[PDB]
């Protein structure tokens, strides 16, 4: 109701008696530090905490606690450790909670140790009040709800200063990074939409697509499966080629280069914005060299080692390596099983009406749904096992534990999210053989063939499904519904502020949010040469996500402790690494799965006339149907208006009427050399461009540096006077 | 003789009267700062300078001047700004000279401005005394001469602390970097010698070299020139192939990878050593943001702009770009002229005894000598023009001027030093055509053909000549003789210390020394896949160079002002960039000029038997001598024991008895694809390995950080007590 209580100790109301004694001595050991009050609740009982005014300077002066001073050159209050202040209430409640948390966790007895032991089942600060109500006291929580956490203010700049003041520099840094990411995604989305519009405009005049779509010509392709399917006409995939043209053209290559430059520019812009926010909030980077607080399990391990009698973690490290390798192998095996799923389901379904008319979408849709559900469960399981792996290695400090767990979880999430996309982009229909000599996995299954029109369309469909159904629909819906579902379950199985805050969901951390954003960034950067509009989908998802996260923080979760951070941490390194890998991934996508290199090679060496006419005939090689290997020919030749004597396919192999029939032709080697040369040139040039963009743009803006120098001069002048 | 004089103003003894007045007011404006004495010399007159004891704390306290304090935990005197001291003589004479230089250059009137105007023709501090003599006072100069500057102490560690104390942190940092470079080059030299020994041992069992050396077989090669030369037997270049085998093999590829890793490790080791030296000497990185001293020409330009009425340097920038492009074009044109030199000289010489028996060495030796002399003169001219280019742009501060001049000079020196080597390695005999269709430069000259045995041997010979005759013999001899020559010229056209120091050569700077070392590093790293023993030659040159530079500093040059530096500066960035480019250069050398890829391709696709037999026949293509283009056949067919009907050559072209005779074969495209794939794989893997080496090794050693933390704790404890 009405008080100034600064923290909330919560314990299970009642060996049971032995555990009760532990919580009777900790408050006694902090009686002279913090004055508490006991609340005899009705359900589980709860304990209040209060910090007195004199204790504030004693603990606020233990470490440098900058506070805004009186002088304000250029309307900027000076931040000084301890110069002069008054009114005995200038501390923000977040700062009071942070000081109280320092007092609790610095005790010898530690709040973390007893929380782990289970004597205390909860501990949190309180919100300033209710975010919604009738004529409420006009707290900062309601201000954030109305001004920042509403879905109707999705277009306006977020009050980042108020967010940092209420929740701390950590959540504030996360939201500032999210806003900068969305703002940078805006122009990239515009350019991608322009590229897509250019492709749509040019699709009608595309010579290869027109040649593929010509129904006057009769081009018969070999079957994509042994006996389930038969010969198909090249014109049957006219829509696929026209759709594909919108995703591979010179505009797409230009957009890939533009997105590499955009990633570099976004990195530089985030560096500058982070420096600006540090100058605005706090620039005291001096901290203990991991000597502030030590991990209690680490302390117990050290005590055990000393009682018995670094580098003793080797069995843990080997276990971590083995577990990670096993996880990656399991993910690859699940991908292989999904591959085997599509082959068996397609063959069985065709043997059965409407089922044989929708074999493509029915097999692909069910496979996609199965993969998405399986990898959701895999993400949960791998997060838990990464928790365990980081626990067993026993990091010395909490910061190292968070660092290593974040690295492991990001690696596992990267593998699970990008394995099927990498497979479809590179290795889907590449390792098969000629129609007379196929390759079978487990000598029972023909592995995989690209859909009529190439595997680029499949990659585009997969990317669209992943970034719309999963990242935009399923993920956000799960985020909204999981806290509500758990609250409803808890309910199934006036009021004081501490009680209502206790009913709120505990804060989990910024790791899942950063993980989602980094995965989306990887989607935007790694796969953009073959798929424009990825920045547009990311922009829409981020527009929803800013308000979703703000609402979750304001209304659902408990108030975090609001510890200090000046950097996003390992996430910047992860972003830089993903951006660096995006250059190689984009180069390989353009060279091997884009079909752009073969068109250039044909135009500049085999065109003769100098145009693109005859490219489809050039890329298609003839095969004699009589050379099928006794059980691979179509079970029922359709015989639409003829009998197939020679079926066409695209492998760059010499014709049956040659001495070296079905062997790799010179055109294959020339096109492969062109692909490799383009990969080399693209990678080197894009890396040089990114390095140039990094080098030209200064890390710290000159204005911030000059303002810092002027502030230091003024502060030293005041100090000596 | 005997005094404590701390600086030496020197002026031309006598508008002349107007200039004399300028030097009469500067000492008056510093009478209260520095007490001078006038020396009425006999030749040109000279002025002494002295700084009093009270002025030392006034100027030493203007900026943080750390001095070793009394406390010494772990035998380490504490470095503090101003805590307590005594004896009134604890300042080193180098520190006294630095303080005096600060006093002189901070005056408004500035010593730099009047030195530029010409009123003062010289200004320097004095050496502690004579480095050699009979029962001399045992100064630090003689200690450095005996202990560090002698050629007989080439094997011992240099007294880097004494060098830094006498000459300052700048020369000390240069010499520490040189010593670390030599120490790192030692193991690399050992591994390279081992690789060379492996090649020498294996050369007898090399199947391709044995096949080339077989005199039983009769393989006739097409002439390498139109009419000057005739058909030659493949066995005539047996020595060339055997010598080449020592420079291209799996050991050479392993050594290229090892040298990439070694460059990364050397960068990390230098970073750690630099941090250690900073901790030992000075860690006060706080300095003015280019606000300490402004360039006098920049001030004059700003005053002119303000009187008339950033980004006004655009005509200067355009001039700089045009001049740099013109310089690079001139260097490339000189390379082209050297190319045209060899063609014309070879043809003319053969038309003439002994001349026709030594056409190869005579043409190549004279061409190499001409190129070396021309590029020496080019280096001098380009250094002067880079001086002018940096002057015209008017850098705001001296540090920016030095930075930009160093960048321009390094770029020009890189171009001049590496243009011929790059040409010989990549573009020498690559752009010629088939024997029936050659390509002529200016339609008068057949451009260039690789010597019998490949262009790898020519590259190895060029590298050996460059790193032995030029970098080791010519460069060191010129360094030793130029100061002696100038001193002898000055002489042709008891004594006080200032006079003898005046006779000494003025200090030029560390830029030429760093430039030589960086060029040698580029030689060691960029071209090492095709040439082992490069680290060995670099190690020998550095062993000579350490003592040569020490002797030059101790005995020849005047004592530098000994300004402070904590980093080598732009040279670290240049080294990192050269190392990064070395990966790509090594990959291209291995793939295109090493002949390693074709051997693998033949062994794994065309070998059949699985061995290397028949590789030489595979790489050689037949040509019908009747297809010469009417003036390209040999003028005099030698007819040793037969008449040539078909001459062989290596171009991967189909034989005359085929329908597509002389066209590019499938083997050419396959080998090109293999080369490009190897380039991609090598570049990516080596970049990842270098990044891993950088990431694993911490930049600052933990010992230095913990010692700094302990020192800070002790200092704060003493400060509060
Ligand atoms: N989404 C999606 C997928 C699509 C398509 F985009 F067209 F719908 C096609 C496809 O072959 N695969 C997809 N996911 C896969 C996972 C493992 C193996 C193959 C996989
Ligand atoms: N040194 C050296 C050179 C050698 C060799 F090593 F064999 F001696 C061979 C060679 O063709 N060239 C050399 N320098 C060149 C500069 C420009 C053009 C060609 C050049
Ligand atoms: Ca989401
Ligand atoms: Ca989220
Ligand atoms: Ca930068
Ligand atoms: Ca030298
Ligand atoms: Ca030198
Ligand atoms: Ca490092």
Author numbering:
A (entry chain B), B (entry chain A): 117 to 130, 165 to 259, 267 to 466, 483 to 525, 528 to 668, 683 to 910
Pull text from the paper:
TMEM16A, a calcium-activated chloride channel involved in multiple cellular processes, is a proposed target for diseases such as hypertension, asthma, and cystic fibrosis. The protein is broadly expressed and mediates vital physiological functions including fluid secretion, smooth muscle contraction, and the control of electrical signaling in certain neurons. TMEM16A is a homodimer with each subunit containing an ion conduction pore. Both pores act independently and are activated by the binding of two Ca2+ ions from the cytoplasm to a conserved site situated in the proximity of the ion conduction path.
With an overall resolution of 2.85 Å, the final map shows well-defined density for the entire protein, including two Ca2+ ions bound at the canonical transmembrane site and at an additional site near the dimer interface that was originally identified in the structures of TMEM16K30 and F31 and whose involvement in channel activation has recently been demonstrated in TMEM16A29. Non-protein density, which is not present in any of the previous maps of TMEM16A, is found at the extracellular end of the hourglass-shaped pore of each subunit. The location of the site within the transmembrane electric field, with a fractional voltage drop of ~0.2 as estimated from Poisson-Boltzmann calculations, is consistent with the voltage dependence and the perceived mechanism of block obtained from functional experiments. The binding site is complementary to the blocker in both its shape and polarity. The binding of the blocker stabilizes an open-like conformation of the channel that involves a rearrangement of several pore helices. The outward movement of α4 widens the outer pore entrance, while the more extended conformational change of α3 relocates Tyr 514 away from the pore and projects the adjacent Arg 515 towards the pore lumen, creating a site that accommodates the blocker. The binding of the blocker to the site immediately external to the narrow neck results in a direct blockade of the ion conduction path, thereby inhibiting channel activity.
